[PDB]
Design a protein around this ligand. Structure first.
Ligand SMILES: Cc1c(S(=O)(=O)N2CCc3[nH]ncc3C2)cc(C(=O)NCc2c(F)ccc3cnn(C)c23)n1C
Ligand SMILES: Nc1ncnc2c1ncn2[C@@H]1O[C@H](CSCC[C@H](N)C(=O)O)[C@@H](O)[C@H]1O
Ligand SMILES: [Cl-]
Ligand SMILES: [Cl-]
Ligand SMILES: [Cl-]
Ligand SMILES: [Zn+2]
Ligand SMILES: [Zn+2]
Ligand SMILES: [Zn+2]
Length: 445
């Protein structure tokens, strides 16, 4: 599939300056009016514009682009504003070099392309012929990576890593948010879901608001479990570390306070992280997976609506990012403020954490944890004790009741500290019911 060049393009959003002729226009004609010869459909570039679904798959490539402005102000979701003075303030030869530099620095570790996100008034499409070249899909002249850049000086193509001195953005993709069935202007729509992006008259602020709005439409409602994103960092080691820590913590809580029920709030797949534990395991999600729905209550947790509920046992909120956690809770939450290639700027102070799936995460807020304390580091095992000795008050094992710690539990401890440290560094924090104490783990022996 791709977006057919013959698909209709609504022209209502385009400023009074830009004509229709007959107002039933297409992408074929718009691309032509932009000054681009579209001969490249056989060679993996059938359309400059892409479907919403293609855009969502390429979310890491999203750069808001708007033009304000004779001289044009070009603005990007990165905060950069460039003013281009045409021949007949800064010249186009210098602007096009800077645009390539900025996109390379932003995208090199995120994506193999750029998707320009537009609220298209006409001028920003008109500008592209000054810094964009289209042609057949190509590899970089120095890598197997797809070509994103062209150098007029040398007739050579580069990826985002190999682009120093390059002057043309090559085969960018773009999406016009105005085609998505909105009414009114950009600000009226953006401001419904976000107070954090202001309306200061520069082009970059329009670019930032457009990407924010698009992020809102495509990610804030729910997790799409059908769309997977490639590995670009330590996803595998981070996710293995988190699952190791999840098991430990929920096991330890279940032994230490002997809760008769665990409420797994935000578990849409009905998979227990401690499957062998003696407890009634209840599953709740705002969006249960259809094939598991029979044994998962559909429920959107808010303290304001459910403080009279989950009165018994312990609530597991494993990256289920609610407004306020009740007092009987074990919580993993991701800090939206951490800098990571995994973590993209999101809507309303939130971030879009793309790690296998795209998880929009509300702004990190201390007040959510008002009824909880930080979970202190500990290692717990009640497994066989078989064979620098380990001198730690946080190794909670039979061999550490008075003896030197066994080779096994000493090895496990150091793997678990490595895992916990990996998880802390990846921007996750752990919270627990205030009455939680390792005192009640030392007694299990
Ligand atoms: C990174 C990640 C998380 S996360 O929890 O770390 N996370 C990140 C930050 C964030 N912000 N907003 C939401 C979230 C969620 C969860 C998953 C995932 O695919 N989970 C699928 C799944 C279930 F749905 C239920 C039971 C299990 C057991 N194993 N897996 C794999 C299960 N990924 C890839
Ligand atoms: N207020 C809320 N109430 C219930 N479920 C919620 C929620 N906010 C988010 N969710 C759900 O929380 C899940 C987060 S992603 C899956 C997390 C899961 N606990 C795991 O171990 O991997 C999604 O399925 C989402 O639908
Ligand atoms: Cl990459
Ligand atoms: Cl050119
Ligand atoms: Cl961020
Ligand atoms: Zn390269
Ligand atoms: Zn915003
Ligand atoms: Zn031991």
């Amino acid at each position: 599939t791709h977006l057919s060049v013959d698909t209709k393009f609504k022209t209502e959003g385009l400023c009074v300056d830009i004509p229709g002729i007959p107002k039933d226009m297409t992408y074929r004609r718009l691309i032509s009016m932009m000054g681009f010869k579209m001969n490249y459909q056989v060679n993996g570039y059938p359309n400059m514009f892409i479907t919403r679904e293609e855009a969502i798959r390429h979310v890491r490539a999203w750069i808001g682009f708007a033009v304000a402005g004779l001289p044009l102000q070009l603005g990007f979701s990165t905060g950069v504003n460039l003013v281009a003075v045409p021949t007949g303030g800064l010249p186009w030869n210098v602007v096009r070099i800077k645009i390539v530099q900025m996109l390379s620095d932003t995208l090199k570790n995120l994506s193999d392309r750029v998707v320009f996100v537009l609220w298209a008034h006409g001028f920003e499409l008109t500008s592209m012929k000054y810094f964009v070249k289209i042609g057949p899909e190509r590899t970089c002249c120095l890598c197997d990576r797809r070509a994103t850049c062209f150098s007029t000086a040398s007739d050579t193509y580069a990826c985002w890593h190999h682009s120093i001195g390059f002057d043309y953005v090559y085969n960018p993709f773009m999406i016009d948010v105005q085609q998505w069935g909105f009414t009114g202007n950009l600000q009226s729509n953006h401001d419904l879901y976000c107070q954090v992006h202001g309306n200061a008259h520069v082009a970059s602020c329009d670019a930032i608001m457009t990407r924010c709005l698009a992020v809102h439409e495509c990610f804030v409602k729910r997790v799409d479990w059908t769309i997977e994103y490639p590995i670009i960092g330590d996803e595998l080691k981070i996710n293995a570390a988190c699952r190791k820590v999840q098991h430990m913590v929920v096991k330890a809580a279940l032994l230490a306070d002997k809760f008769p029920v665990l409420h797994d709030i935000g578990n849409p797949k009905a998979i227990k992280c401690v499957p062998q534990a003696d407890v009634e395991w209840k599953f709740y999600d705002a969006q249960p997976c259809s094939d598991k729905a029979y044994k998962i209550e559909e429920l959107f947790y808010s303290y304001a609506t459910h403080s009279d509920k989950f009165t018994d046992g312990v609530c597991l909120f494993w990256n289920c990012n609610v407004d306020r956690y009740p007092a009987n809770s074990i919580v993993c939450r991701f800090d939206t403020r951490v800098l990571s290639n995994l973590n993209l700027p999101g809507c309303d102070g939130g971030s879009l954490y793309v790690n296998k799936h795209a998880f929009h995460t509300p702004a990190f807020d201390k007040s959510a944890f008002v009824n909880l304390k930080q979970l202190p580091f500990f290692y717990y095992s009640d497994s066989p004790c078989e064979s620098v000795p380990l001198k730690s008050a946080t190794c909670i094992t039979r061999c550490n009741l008075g003896g030197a710690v066994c080779r096994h539990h000493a090895n496990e401890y150091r793997l678990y500290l490595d895992a916990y440290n990996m998880m802390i560094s990846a921007g996750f924090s752990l919270w627990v019911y205030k009455q939680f104490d390792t005192y009640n783990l030392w007694n299990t022996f």
